[PDB]
Amino acid sequence: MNIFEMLRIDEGLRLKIYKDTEGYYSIGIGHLLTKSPSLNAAKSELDKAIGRNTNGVITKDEAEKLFNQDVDAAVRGILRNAKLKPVYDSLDAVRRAALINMVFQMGETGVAGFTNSLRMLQQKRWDEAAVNLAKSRWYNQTPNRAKRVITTFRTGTWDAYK
């Protein structure tokens, strides 16, 4: 298992524009296009990102390409973020993938916000962090996904994805 396979299970893959869990326009493997409620605003963003008139549909390749860009961006954002980096640096490889999954889903800013959980993680207080992470809108809205990620932080194994 690795980050790519992990996110691929969490996000799925769709080749046509779709509404995500929050009702926003997305495509491929969890690639947000736009938060605007306009399908045309979506299509526009889509063509701009692929560099062709897609008309709302992309290939498997195109999707994987956006995915690769998106994972790269998450990692680099973590590395760039004063609050996140130190947490990342402190973790093991499995747990680093769980942090990346969160940043991919919610954004760097959204995650940097989990102050208390972040601190618990840096301290390696696993069971505490897990409890704290569960008290969040994130867990209430996407509970199955959140449980997978939390179990991952809890254990340092990939069992939730097995």
Q: Which residues are annotated as a binding site for substrate?
A: 32, 104, 117, 132
The three-state secondary structure class of 27 is strand
Strands 25-28 and 31-34: antiparallel
Catalytic residue among 5, 10, 20, 45: 20
Nearer to Cl ion, 40 or 144 (CB): 144
Residue 89 among the catalytic residues: no
* Structure letter (DSSP) for residue 17: E
Nearer to Cl ion, 11 or 97 (CB): 11
- 103 part of the interface to Cl ion, by CB under 5 A: no
- 29-68: which residues touch Cl ion (CB under 5 A)? 49
- 144 part of the interface to Cl ion, by CB under 5 A: yes
Nearer to Cl ion, 124 or 137 (CB): 137
User: Concatenated DSSP letters for 47-110?
Assistant: HHHHTS--TTB--HHHHHHHHHHHHHHHHHHHHH-TTTHHHHHHS-HHHHHHHHHHHHHHHHHH
Residue 127 among the catalytic residues: no
Catalytic residue among 10, 11, 62, 108: 11
Cα–Cα separations (whole angstroms), residue 59 to 2, 15, 66, 157: 23, 6, 11, 33
Q: Find the shortest distance in angstroms from Cβ 1 to Cl ion.
A: 19
**Residue 146 C-beta-side C-alpha neighbours within 13 Å:** 17
Nearer to Cl ion, 27 or 112 (CB): 27
**Among the listed residues 43, 95, 145, 148, the single contact to Cl ion using CB under 5 A:** 145
- 142 part of the interface to Cl ion, by CB under 5 A: yes
Binding site for Cl ion (CB under 5 A): 49, 142, 144-145
Catalytic residue positions, numbered: 11, 20
